[PDB]
Amino acid sequence: SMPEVSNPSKPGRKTNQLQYMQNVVVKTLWKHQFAWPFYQPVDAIKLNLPDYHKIIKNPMDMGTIKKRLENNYYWSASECMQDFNTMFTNCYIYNKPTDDIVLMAQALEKIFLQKVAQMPQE
Amino acid sequence: TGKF
Numbered sequence A: 001s002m003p004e005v006s007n008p009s010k011p012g013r014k015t016n017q018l019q020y021m022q023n024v025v026v027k028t029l030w031k032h033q034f035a036w037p038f039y040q041p042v043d044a045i046k047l048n049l050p051d052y053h054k055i056i057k058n059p060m061d062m063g064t065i066k067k068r069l070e071n072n073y074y075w076s077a078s079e080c081m082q083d084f085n086t087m088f089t090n091c092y093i094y095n096k097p098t099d100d101i102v103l104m105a106q107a108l109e110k111i112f113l114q115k116v117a118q119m120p121q122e
Numbered sequence B: 001t002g003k004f
Helices: A016-030 A062-070 A077-094 A100-116
Strands: none
Touching (some): A016 A077, A062 A077, A077 A100
């Protein structure tokens, strides 16, 4: 199923960094011409990737990340950054080195890190 | 199989 975007038993809040993650990082990446394969969870049935969940045990996508930020799901920007890293790393692990989507992920991840390098201090 |  889709990853959880809310959890009443997980401590969450909205920090200055987390608002930067929502209003600068996600916004910048979402507008990128390479971002669309990351907008929604990988649908291994629709995409005919029958072994996707054999190889990838912790799926993540930008749609989930954006909803978690909207729900104040995270306690720290660190947690949100790790979700982005999981999303990109999953793509490198599952797909072929020569696939377009790997190149697209590499260009998106570089922008993600550029923006994180300018995140405000907590 | 695979993506693209």
